[PDB]
């Protein structure tokens, strides 16, 4: 939090991106840095089992957590499978101004 | 389509009892397709559903070719009985039908080998069609003549 | 081969906390590698226009990353370990004169060569709204040796700033000067590839050759890759011998 | 057959038909750096006007989130305008989109793009390449985009490339903090400490977690926004010296107006910019990929490098697998009908029956104006196979007449065709009429229904109207040739 | 049990934030477990010197 | 560890990557057994030992 994309790309994205490199069945990696947030989506060869891809990425990342700045470590790194799609969107709304 | 087939079965073959055979056969030839689609990783999605519409075609054609040819032979000879006629016609078409199911599947499997996102889309359609031709053809071989 | 790695990794994570801090900062690596050399690829400057420190760096950044990605490569490592590092060569006779310990240099560099967090201007919640949200950016990591030299150890009260330049010499050298590599008689960087467990050596060997051909097209003038030691060569050769025997 | 290839060339090749999903996504981006309050006002103006239109029943909005470049940008905001049921609204999504575009066509505070939701999620309808220009020399992002805008100008000259665009934007306002390390040190201040003060006052500092409702929640410290809004915010912030002396941040720190990239992108472990492009309507997707690669290598420096993502990646890394498979499939079909007829030459007659179906399908789509979509291709698989089935039967029955009944080569081709007349008519009639509702289908999935349907109807009609007359002619020729060989 | 473990570890990793910091620092451990006691071995000093 | 050995303090930006900073003494000063005598540490009472 509170870091510019250039800082987050050099300080956070670069260490993580390097560790995940070489993970099996990985075709390419893409990372975008925005102030305060780093999003890095690994892309894997078609037919790779998601559960196996996720666990590998997680392994490699937990080795490079320590290199990361402390503020980032305090909040930690989230690894998820993004293969999912949106079934539906449910918007809870305050019709009134009471919430 | 099922009702339209009945209309063609009724006008062309001039029999009302002949319509029952497509009615029993076509659902069996689609339920069978579903069972295989379950065994294989295939799910019901928009693209498979579109394929099912295409699959209706293969199934209807198979019933129509068999019933009609039996009726044709049953009208070619007064002396021939319905069961002899069925055997005759089946002997004539059994070899083509097996060849039809092999040829047709040869047409569809390469579509599955297409690489890229468009081949994944195309394979959902193709493999479903290939399942349909095989299940339909087995039914045409066994169930349809018996009902006829 | 893959579930073992997962199991080894899962069990190590609890141990990773217990490990010494320095070890954990550098990281601990669990890779499915046989540790038996599939092949050694030698990238060398024929022109001699590139010094060994530079050649190593080119093959780390440009080639090694690509080879690690290739399917069937558990790990590809260049032997020299001469990756760039800013090296601050302390001189203990100048440190002793200016009364500065090594530790005061270590603390100084950590504090003055880091990038920290600076927030945005105009962000909400603000009562008096502003037209724009502007983000403060900072550069706190020095990129040059002359900048590293100017890190300030102490203010000498004449407002003279004692700096690293005074107690030490800074240069961009290499992290480890321990090992080198040679091809024939000349110097080269050796990239040793270990096969991932459960993968075909011949397929991986052919893939590494084809990636290297693609990479070579972009090589800076004066760079040749040779792969002198390849294990699969013998295997493929014996396949050819048995094919000839079949014809005969 | 020549006409088939003319028709295939004139019909546009499009991946999947654009479809009304009922939602009219709207991306609104204000100028770079715009505060959320400006963006929210704009969203509000956009949505009350939309309320006026009957078709748009409701509207969901996501202020501060840029849909295109997933990220939280205050200037950006997306307003999805939910439409009414297809059966309740006469106007199509496209018509409503035009009305929205027309009202906002005038220059205003924001820029709005109105689009229908992607037909198939996760897939670009375009044949566009995504190319990442990785920088191996360490040049700054601002320098990177001046290099890439040059790539862009060369790209727009080339014919194959169309709509070439880049994602990188260095336009966003930024403040550069200049640190006088001479003063900071002299003031006896440690650099980490002077940034902890900035992180607490100007930005948000998360010290520790507090318990609430059974779930730990963050404790954060930031200053009243009245203080943060102005550039001289720095002057009210103070840091203690090691000599216990309050020293204002503005002394040793200066904020300078600057422009820089909000979103920094690194691809494959290298700093990168993303170039998206579309193929030229005439040119193929593969040709476009090759063209941009050439442009990139000359315009960009040797230091740059080019990599591919998504569809482009697969095309570059393609083993030509489909081609090998198709050749094998044909060879297999050849042989399996050779076995049936016990003649090497005879299965050629069956393969000749196939282009009549394909011709009906591509003719009708051309008249309709429909493109060569995936739906059309899948239609073909059915068409081909149905045509083949009909042909296999005509040929087999013909063989029987020639052999078993000893009919003449000419008489056999007349008899077989007439025996097989009725089954072909019956099946075609049932199926064509069965899929005729597709042509007229309206509602969700309508474009897809129409596309699959138009090809099917045309092919089926052609196979029954034309193929049946022709297949005996092929058989007649082959049987005559076999007899000639016997002589 | 091997694939079940992967699916638990992956789900926990996705929910990094929900966890409090002190648990993160220590780490969360996901390991296949079995409650069956095949046997209990008891080692004793006959001498009792130990 | 910073005069006989190399101490990795932090990372410095070069070529789009992060490279280590290592503080080690000049070679001649770590070349002998008595190397230890040249090195000096300050105490709590600010006197070099
Ligand atoms: C970023 C997206 C992946 S989300 C958007 C679209 N989203 C939806 O259709 C959501 N179900 C939705 C969001 C807001 C309002 C109504 C629907 C989709 O996923 O295709 N299209 C994409 C896009 O806009 O680039």
3-state secondary structure chain D: CHHHHHHHHHCCCCCCCCCCCCEEEEEEECCCCECHHHHHHHHHHHHHHHHHCCCCCEEEEEEEEECCCCEEEEEEEEEEEECCCCCCCCCCHHHHHHHHHHHCCCCCCCEEEEEECCCCCCCCCCCCCEEEEEECCCCCHHHHHHHHHHHHHHHHHCCCEEEEEECCCCCCEEEEEEECHHHHHHCCCCHHHHHHHHHHHCCCEEEEEEEECCEEEEEEECCCHHHHCCHHHHHHCEEECCCCCEEEHHHHEEEEEEECCCCEEEECCEECCEEEEEECCCCCHHHHHHHHHHHHHHHCCCCEEEEEECHHHHHHCCCCHHHHHHHHHHHHHHHHHHHHHCCCCCHHHHHHHHHHHHHHHHHHHHHHCCCCCHHHHHHHHHHHHHHHHHHHHHHHHHHHHHHCCCCCHHHHHHHHHHHCHHHHHHHHHHHHHHHHHHHCCCCCCHHHHHHHHHHHHHHHHHHHHHHHHHHHHHHHHHHHHHHHHHC
Q: Nearest-CA neighbor of A29 among C65, C214, E28, C138?
A: C65
Q: How far apart are CA B15 and CA D86, in angstroms?
A: 43
User: What are the residues whose beta carbons fall under 8 Å from the beta carbon of D463, sequence distance 6 or more?
Assistant: D353, D356, D357, D360, D383, D386, D387, D390, D424, D428
User: What are the residues whose beta carbons fall under 8 Å from the beta carbon of C144, sequence distance 6 or more?
Assistant: none
The residue to which tokens 């591919």 are assigned: D308
Instruction: For residue C204, say if its preceding peptide bond is cis, omega within 30 degrees of 0.
Output: no
Q: Nearest-CA neighbor of D128 among D346, D287, D318, D260?
A: D287
Q: How far apart are CA B139 and CA B129, in angstroms?
A: 15
Q: How far apart are CA C46 and CA D326, in angstroms?
A: 48
β-strand partners of D10: none
State the number of CA atoms in the 13 A half-sphere of D363 facing the CB.
Answer: 17
Identify the DSSP state of F30: G
User: What distance in angstroms lies between residue D117's CA and the mean position of ligand 1's atoms?
Assistant: 7
Question: Is the beta carbon of D281 within 6 A of some atom in ligand 1?
Answer: no
Kindly report each contact of residues C99-102 with a partner whose C-beta sits within 8 Å and lies 24 or more positions away, as own/partner.
C99/F42, C99/F48, C100/C153, C100/C154, C100/C162, C100/C167, C101/F40, C101/F41, C101/F42, C101/F48, C102/F2, C102/F3, C102/F7, C102/F23, C102/F25, C102/F39
β-strand partners of A37: A34
Strand, helix or coil at C201? helix
CB contact under 8 A, F29 and C113: no
- What sign does the dihedral C111-C117-C121-C125 (CA atoms) show? negative
The answer to whether the beta carbons of residues D225 and C127 sit under 8 Å apart is: yes
Q: Which helix (H) or strand (E) holds C67?
A: helix C65-69
Sheet holding F17-25: strands in order across?
C168-174, C84-90, F17-25, F7-14
Candidate of D118, D124, D276, D310 to mutate for ligand 1, largest count of ligand atoms within 8 Å of Cβ: D118
What number does the ligand 1 atom closest to the CA of D60 have? 15
Identify the DSSP state of B19: T
Strand, helix or coil at A3? coil
Question: Is the beta carbon of D120 within 6 A of some atom in ligand 1?
Answer: no
Q: How many CB pairs under 8 A join A and F?
A: 6
Q: Exposed, middle or buried: residue A86 (CB in 10 Å: 0-12, 13-18, 19+)?
A: exposed
∠ at Cα B12 (B7, B14), nearest 5°?
90
Q: How far apart are CA D291 and CA D272, in angstroms?
A: 19
Q: What is the CA radius of gyration of chain A?
A: 17
Q: How far apart are CA B80 and CA B86, in angstroms?
A: 10
Please give the structure tokens belonging to residue C22.
Answer: 């320095």
Q: How far apart are CA A56 and CA A44, in angstroms?
A: 12
What number does the ligand 1 atom closest to the CA of D62 have? 14
CB contact under 8 A, A63 and C16: yes
User: What are the residues whose beta carbons fall under 8 Å from the beta carbon of C115, sequence distance 6 or more?
Assistant: A3, A7, A10, A11, C138, C139, C140, C141
User: What are the residues whose beta carbons fall under 8 Å from the beta carbon of F8, sequence distance 6 or more?
Assistant: C25, C26, F20, F21, F22
The answer to whether the beta carbons of residues E26 and A76 sit under 8 Å apart is: no
User: Chains that contact A by 3+ CB pairs under 8 Å?
Assistant: C, D, E, F
Q: Nearest-CA neighbor of A43 among A62, A61, A23, A59?
A: A23
User: What are the residues whose beta carbons fall under 8 Å from the beta carbon of F21, sequence distance 6 or more?
Assistant: C85, C86, C87, C88, C109, C113, C148, F8, F9, F10, F11, F12
Breaks (C-N over 2.5 A) in chain E follow: none
Cβ of residue D113 closer than 8 Å to a chain F Cβ: no
Distances in Å between the alpha carbon of D484 and those of C115, D69, D472?
89, 71, 18
The residue in chain D having the minimum alpha-carbon distance to the alpha carbon of residue C152 is D185
User: What distance in angstroms lies between residue B47's CA and the mean position of ligand 1's atoms?
Assistant: 20
Q: In Å, how far from its chain's centre is CA A64?
A: 14
Cβ of residue C85 closer than 8 Å to a chain E Cβ: no
Q: Nearest-CA neighbor of B69 among B100, B104, B94, B99?
A: B94
Please give the structure tokens belonging to residue C89.
Answer: 């060569």
What number does the ligand 1 atom closest to the CA of D21 have? 9
The answer for F 11-40 residues in CB contact with D (under 8 A) is 14-16
Question: Is the beta carbon of D478 within 6 A of some atom in ligand 1?
Answer: no
Q: How far apart are CA A59 and CA E6, in angstroms?
A: 11
User: What distance in angstroms lies between residue B128's CA and the mean position of ligand 1's atoms?
Assistant: 29
Closest-CA residue, ligand 1 atom 14, reads D80
Chains D and E touch (3+ CB pairs under 8 A): yes
Please give the structure tokens belonging to residue D460.
Answer: 């089926």
Domain D23-114: homologous superfamily in CATH: Multidrug efflux transporter AcrB pore domain (3.30.70.1430)
For C86, phi and psi rounded to 5 degrees? -85, 125
CB contact under 8 A, D195 and C118: yes
* Contact residues, chain B, for D330 at CB < 8 Å: 106
CB contact under 8 A, D176 and C137: yes
For C14, phi and psi rounded to 5 degrees? -65, -40
Final resolution, Å: 3.2
Q: Exposed, middle or buried: residue B107 (CB in 10 Å: 0-12, 13-18, 19+)?
A: buried
Question: Is the beta carbon of D23 within 6 A of some atom in ligand 1?
Answer: yes
Strand, helix or coil at A91? coil
Question: Is the beta carbon of D79 within 6 A of some atom in ligand 1?
Answer: no
Q: In Å, how far from its chain's centre is CA A51?
A: 15
Cβ of residue E42 closer than 8 Å to a chain C Cβ: no
Question: Is the beta carbon of D115 within 6 A of some atom in ligand 1?
Answer: no
Q: Which helix (H) or strand (E) holds C40?
A: strand C33-45
Question: Is the beta carbon of D125 within 6 A of some atom in ligand 1?
Answer: no
Q: How far apart are CA D136 and CA D272, in angstroms?
A: 9
The answer to whether the beta carbons of residues D158 and D291 sit under 8 Å apart is: yes
Q: Which of A58, A63, A79 to mutate to test the interface with C (most CBs of C within 10 A)?
A: A63
Q: Exposed, middle or buried: residue D251 (CB in 10 Å: 0-12, 13-18, 19+)?
A: middle
Q: How far apart are CA C208 and CA C193, in angstroms?
A: 9
Strands F7-14 and F17-25: antiparallel
Q: Nearest-CA neighbor of C25 among C101, C140, C110, C105?
A: C110
Please give the structure tokens belonging to residue F26.
Answer: 């000049």
Distances in Å between the alpha carbon of C88 and those of C74, E50, F3, F6, F9?
34, 57, 10, 10, 10
Identify the DSSP state of B2: H
* Contact residues, chain F, for C89 at CB < 8 Å: 24-26
Q: How many CB pairs under 8 A join A and C?
A: 60
Q: Please write down the HEC assignment for all residues of C165-189.
A: HHHEEEEEEECCCCCCCEECCEECE
CB contact under 8 A, A59 and C136: no
D51-65 burial, b at 16+ Cβ within 10 Å, e below that, comes to eebebbeebebebbe
The answer to whether the beta carbons of residues D133 and D148 sit under 8 Å apart is: yes
Question: Is the beta carbon of D441 within 6 A of some atom in ligand 1?
Answer: no
Other beta carbons within 10 angstroms of residue E45's beta carbon come to 7
User: Chains that contact C by 3+ CB pairs under 8 Å?
Assistant: A, D, E, F
Question: Is the beta carbon of D122 within 6 A of some atom in ligand 1?
Answer: no
Strand, helix or coil at C38? strand
What number does the ligand 1 atom closest to the CA of D80 have? 15
* Contact residues, chain A, for E7 at CB < 8 Å: 51
User: What distance in angstroms lies between residue A96's CA and the mean position of ligand 1's atoms?
Assistant: 27
* Contact residues, chain D, for C114 at CB < 8 Å: 191-192
User: What distance in angstroms lies between residue D412's CA and the mean position of ligand 1's atoms?
Assistant: 62
Candidate of D117, D128, D310 to mutate for ligand 1, largest count of ligand atoms within 8 Å of Cβ: D117
Please give the structure tokens belonging to residue D260.
Answer: 């820089």
Q: In Å, how far from its chain's centre is CA D391?
A: 39
CB contact under 8 A, D396 and B96: yes
Q: Nearest-CA neighbor of D26 among D105, D101, D114, D96?
A: D114
CB contact under 8 A, C11 and E31: yes
Q: Exposed, middle or buried: residue D8 (CB in 10 Å: 0-12, 13-18, 19+)?
A: middle
The answer to whether the beta carbons of residues F41 and C101 sit under 8 Å apart is: yes
Q: Exposed, middle or buried: residue D260 (CB in 10 Å: 0-12, 13-18, 19+)?
A: buried
Q: How far apart are CA B93 and CA B97, in angstroms?
A: 6
Question: Is the beta carbon of A86 within 6 A of some atom in ligand 1?
Answer: yes
User: What distance in angstroms lies between residue D198's CA and the mean position of ligand 1's atoms?
Assistant: 37
User: What are the residues whose beta carbons fall under 8 Å from the beta carbon of D172, sequence distance 6 or more?
Assistant: C135, D32, D33, D259, D260, D261, D262
Other beta carbons within 10 angstroms of residue B54's beta carbon come to 24
CB contact under 8 A, B60 and D375: no
Q: How far apart are CA D28 and CA D26, in angstroms?
A: 6
The answer to whether the beta carbons of residues D462 and D356 sit under 8 Å apart is: yes
Q: How far is E4 from chain C (nearest CA, A)?
A: 12
Q: How far apart are CA D115 and CA D104, in angstroms?
A: 14
Please give the structure tokens belonging to residue E32.
Answer: 């296949």
Please give the structure tokens belonging to residue D281.
Answer: 């309507």
β-strand partners of F23: C88, F7
Q: How far apart are CA E21 and CA D199, in angstroms?
A: 20
What number does the ligand 1 atom closest to the CA of D82 have? 16
C5-37 burial, b at 16+ Cβ within 10 Å, e below that, comes to bbeebbeebeebeeeeeeebeebbebbbbbeee
Q: How far apart are CA B146 and CA C240, in angstroms?
A: 58
The answer to whether the beta carbons of residues D417 and D471 sit under 8 Å apart is: yes
The residue in chain E having the minimum alpha-carbon distance to the alpha carbon of residue C4 is E2
Class of the domain covering D173-259:
alpha beta
């Amino acid at each position: 939090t509170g870091a510019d994309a250039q800082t987050i790309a050099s300080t956070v994205a670069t260490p993580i991106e390097d560790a995940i490199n070489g993970v099996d069945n990985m075709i390419y990696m893409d990372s975008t840095s925005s102030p305060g947030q780093m999003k890095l989506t690994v892309y894997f060869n078609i037919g790779t089992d998601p559960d196996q891809a996720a666990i590998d990425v997680n392994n490699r990342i937990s080795a490079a957590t320590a290199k990361l700045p402390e503020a980032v470590k305090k909040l930690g790194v989230t690894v998820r499978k993004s293969s999912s799609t949106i079934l539906e969107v449910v918007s809870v709304y305050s019709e009134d101004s009471s919430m | 389509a099922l009702a339209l087939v009945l209309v063609v079965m009724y006008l062309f073959l001039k029999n009302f009892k002949s319509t029952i055979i497509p009615m029993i056969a076509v659902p069996v030839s689609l339920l069978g397709t579903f069972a295989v689609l379950y065994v294989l990783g295939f799910s019901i999605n928009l693209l498979t559903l579109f394929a099912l519409v295409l699959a209706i075609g293969i199934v209807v054609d198979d019933a129509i070719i068999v019933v009609e040819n039996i009726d044709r032979i049953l009208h070619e000879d007064s002396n021939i009985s319905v069961k002899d006629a069925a055997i005759k016609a089946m002997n004539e078409v059994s070899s083509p039908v097996i060849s039809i199911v092999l040829v047709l599947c040869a047409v569809f499997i390469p579509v599955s080998f297409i690489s890229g996102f468009v081949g994944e889309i195309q394979r959902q359609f193709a493999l479903t069609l290939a399942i349909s031709v095989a299940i339909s053809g087995f039914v045409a071989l066994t169930l349809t003549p018996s009902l006829s | 081969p893959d579930q073992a790695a997962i199991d080894v990794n899962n069990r190590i994570s609890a141990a990773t906390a217990k490990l010494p801090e320095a070890v954990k900062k550098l990281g601990v690596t669990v890779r499915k590698s046989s540790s038996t050399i599939l092949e050694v690829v030698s990238v060398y400057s024929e022109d001699s226009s590139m010094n060994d420190i530079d050649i190593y760096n080119y093959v780390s950044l440009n080639i090694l990353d690509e080879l690690k990605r290739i399917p069937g490569v558990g790990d590809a490592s260049a032997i020299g370990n001469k990756n760039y590092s800013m090296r601050i060569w302390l001189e203990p006779d100048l440190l002793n004169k200016f009364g500065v310990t090594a530790n005061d240099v270590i603390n100084a560099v950590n504090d003055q060569n880091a990038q920290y967090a600076t927030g945005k201007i105009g962000e909400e919640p603000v009562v008096n709204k502003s037209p724009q949200v502007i983000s403060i950016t900072m550069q706190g990591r020095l990129q040059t040796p002359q900048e590293f030299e100017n890190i300030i150890l102490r203010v000498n009260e004449d407002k003279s700033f004692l700096r690293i330049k005074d107690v030490a010499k800074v240069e961009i050298g290499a992290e480890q000067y321990n090992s080198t590599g040679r091809l024939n008689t000349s110097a080269a960087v050796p990239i040793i590839i270990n096969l991932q467990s459960g993968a075909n050596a011949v397929n991986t060997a052919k893939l590494i050759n084809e990636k290297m051909q693609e990479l070579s097209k972009n090589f800076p003038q004066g760079l040749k890759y040779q792969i002198p030691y390849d294990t699969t060569i013998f295997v493929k050769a014996s396949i050819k011998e048995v094919i000839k025997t079949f014809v005969e | 057959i020549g006409f088939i290839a003319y028709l295939f060339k004139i019909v546009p090749s499009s991946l999947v038909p654009s479809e009304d999903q009922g939602v009219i996504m709207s991306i609104i981006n204000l100028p770079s750096g715009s505060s959320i309050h400006r963006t929210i006002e704009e969203v509000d103006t956009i949505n009350k006007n939309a309320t006026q239109m009957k078709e748009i029943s409701s509207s969901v909005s996501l202020i501060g989130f840029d849909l295109f470049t997933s990220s939280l940008k205050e200037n950006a905001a997306a307003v999805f305008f939910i439409l009414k049921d297809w059966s309740q609204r006469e106007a199509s999504s496209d018509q409503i989109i035009a009305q929205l575009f027309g009202q906002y066509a005038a220059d205003r505070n924001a820029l709005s793009y109105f689009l229908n939701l992607p037909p198939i999620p996760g897939l670009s309808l375009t044949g566009g390449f995504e190319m990442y220009a990785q920088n191996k020399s360490g040049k700054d992002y601002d320098a990177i985009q001046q290099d890439v805008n040059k790539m862009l100008e060369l790209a727009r000259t080339r014919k194959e490339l169309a709509n070439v665009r880049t994602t990188l934007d260095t336009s966003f306002p930024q403040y550069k903090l200049i640190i006088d390390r001479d003063k900071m040190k002299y003031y006896n201040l440690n650099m980490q400490d002077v940034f902890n003060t900035i992180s607490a006052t100007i930005g948000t500092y998360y010290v520790n977690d507090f318990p609430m409702l059974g779930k730990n929640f963050q404790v954060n410290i930031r200053a009243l926004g009245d203080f943060r809004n102005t550039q001289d915010a720095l002057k009210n912030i103070y840091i203690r010296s090691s000599d216990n002396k309050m020293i204002p941040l503005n002394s040793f720190l200066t904020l300078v107006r600057s422009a820089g990239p909000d979103d920094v992108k690194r691809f494959n472990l290298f700093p990168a910019a993303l170039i998206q492009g579309d193929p030229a309507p005439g040119y193929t997707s593969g040709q476009a990929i090759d063209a941009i690669a050439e442009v990139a290598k000359q315009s960009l420096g040797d230091e740059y490098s080019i990599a591919w993502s998504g569809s482009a990646y697969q095309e570059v890394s393609s083993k030509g697998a489909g081609a090998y498979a198709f050749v094998l499939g044909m060879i297999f079909v050849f042989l399996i009908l050779a076995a049936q007829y016990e003649r090497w030459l005879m299965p050629l007659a069956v393969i000749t029956a196939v282009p009549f179906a394909v011709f009906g399908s591509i003719l009708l789509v051309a008249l309709r104006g429909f493109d060569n979509d995936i739906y059309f291709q899948t239609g073909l698989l059915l068409l081909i196979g149905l045509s083949a089935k009909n042909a296999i039967l005509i040929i087999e029955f013909a063989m029987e007449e020639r052999l078993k009944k000893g009919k003449s080569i000419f008489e056999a081709a007349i008899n077989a065709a007439k025996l097989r007349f009725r089954p072909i008519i019956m099946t075609s009639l049932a199926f064509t009429f069965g899929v005729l509702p597709m042509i007229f289908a309206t509602g969700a999935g309508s474009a897809s229904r129409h596309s699959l349907g138009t090809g099917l109807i045309g092919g089926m009609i052609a196979a029954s109207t034309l193929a049946i007359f022709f297949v005996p002619l092929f058989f007649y020729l082959l049987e005559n040739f076999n007899e000639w060989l016997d002589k």
